[PDB]
């Protein structure tokens, strides 16, 4: 089979300036028809891939023309001539000529914006939660940059572990920041024997971490 | 100009068939062709085959002959079947289609389904328990505060999560599942809105788990301090 490298696997790029994202063939591209069958794709969280280039360096339809593809062989690479903040995503190529159609690995797109210290909140369990026996404490890190954040809870000052789960969303099209979400979980019992809950967050924009917290039963 | 409508995300046991269906409209002056693809959570992109305008079929050796794609009574209507399914199969599926103008000329992979989830497992399906996250002064930021709420213990993915029935989308962020020591899946989607329309607004989650046709609406109200 086909074996399609993609160069680099990662794309940090700051906002105006050029990309460029290559592809490699194991086997010349080239077909019998003196066409050249090489695709590129792009493809946003949890969504499906969208068609950008067909033989090498056509555009589709509604794709501007600061994206452009060239090559010939085995030798492929997209460019994006000035990156917007809605070019994030994972660029991946393909080729049809040859059986099977192979992909190559994804280049993920990122914006280098400036430091945006992220907006911490926290959230209390619901009585819903609670009549069931568990607790969970929502800890949320809204439209930060860059990615790197971290994320500590504190029961009455004490440091938990092993008892929390967080996930981060892809970067943001149109402010190019990340949300990160975390939960804490704990039974009704140990929930109900601790009174201060927090969740203490640490990253570049904030010149000292910054500590959320309840105690519950306040309100 | 094109639609490609698939079936919906599921669970398939072990050794068993998984069987998809996809619809595609908007062709009318050419042929068309319909070629199949698959992402495991978190990689990247496999080719699984195709179905050629006359009916005929090219497969992924890879597939190992476990891959059947076919077309069905319905106009435009076609099913894949993989039998003896492993973990290997756990992916998203997609069906692409492109205008077949003849033999020598045809294009590929121009318009794409949505994707559909199949979660190759022996386990029962399990609808989300919804919980709120409340806004307080906890959650207010100058003006602005943040709501949302925890769908939690359910099982397979995914989930989808609107607000206000679709009408609110602005300031929305509906994070990655998490997978519990338990085996289901915990998501939360969080929404930041003026704090001056809490007293006036109704904040309400629409979870929908098509898995185990589980919808729930979660209002969210507001606490005290």
């Known amino acids: 089979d086909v074996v399609m490298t993609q160069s680099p696997l990662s794309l940090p790029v700051t906002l105006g300036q050029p990309a460029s994202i290559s592809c490699k063939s194991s086997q010349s591209l080239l077909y019998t028809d003196g066409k050249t069958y090489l695709y590129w794709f792009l493809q946003r969280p949890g969504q499906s891939p969208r068609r950008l280039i067909y033989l090498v360096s056509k555009l589709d339809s509604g794709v501007p023309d600061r994206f452009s593809g060239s090559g010939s062989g085995t030798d492929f690479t997209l460019k994006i001539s000035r990156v917007e903040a809605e070019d994030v995503g994972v660029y991946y190529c393909?080729?049809?000529?040859?059986?099977?159609?192979?992909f190559g690995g994804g280049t993920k797109v990122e914006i280098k914006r400036t430091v945006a210290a992220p907006s911490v909140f926290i959230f209390p369990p619901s009585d819903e939660q609670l009549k069931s026996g568990t607790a969970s404490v929502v800890c949320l890190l809204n439209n930060f940059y860059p990615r790197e954040a971290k994320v500590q809870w504190k029961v009455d000052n004490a440091l938990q572990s092993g008892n929390s789960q967080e996930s981060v969303t892809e970067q943001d099209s149109k402010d190019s920041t990340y949300s990160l979400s975390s939960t804490l979980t704990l039974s009704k019992a140990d929930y109900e024997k601790h009174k201060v809950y927090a969740c203490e967050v640490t990253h570049q924009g904030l010149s000292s971490p910054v500590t959320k917290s309840f105690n519950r039963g306040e309100c | 100009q094109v639609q490609l409508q698939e079936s919906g995300p599921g669970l398939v046991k072990p050794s068993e068939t998984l069987s998809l269906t996809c619809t595609v409209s908007?062709?009318?002056?050419?042929?068309?062709?319909v070629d199949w693809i698959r992402q495991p959570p978190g990689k990247g992109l496999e080719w699984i085959g195709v179905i050629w305008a006359g009916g005929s079929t090219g497969y992924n050796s890879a597939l190992r002959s476990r891959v059947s794609i076919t077309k069905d009574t319905s106009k435009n209507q076609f099913s894949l079947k993989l039998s003896s399914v492993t973990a290997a199969d756990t992916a998203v599926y997609y069906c692409?289609?492109?205008?077949?103008?003849?033999?020598?000329?045809?294009?590929?992979?121009?318009?794409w389904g949505q994707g559909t989830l199949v979660t190759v497992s022996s386990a029962s399906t399990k609808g989300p328990s919804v919980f709120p996250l409340a806004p307080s002064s906890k959650s207010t930021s100058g003006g602005t505060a943040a709501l949302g709420c925890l769908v939690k213990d359910y099982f397979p993915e995914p989930v989808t999560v609107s607000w206000n029935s679709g009408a609110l989308t602005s300031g929305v962020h509906t994070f990655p599942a998490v997978l519990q020591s338990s085996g289901l899946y915990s998501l939360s989607s969080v929404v930041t809105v003026p704090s001056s329309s809490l007293g006036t607004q109704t904040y309400i989650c629409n979870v929908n788990h098509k898995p185990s046709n589980t919808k729930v609406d979660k209002k969210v109200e507001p606490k005290s301090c």
């Open positions: 393909l080729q049809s000529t040859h059986f099977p159609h192979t």
């Open positions: 908007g062709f009318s002056l050419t042929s068309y062709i």
């Open positions: 692409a289609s492109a205008a077949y103008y003849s033999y020598y000329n045809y294009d590929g992979f121009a318009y």
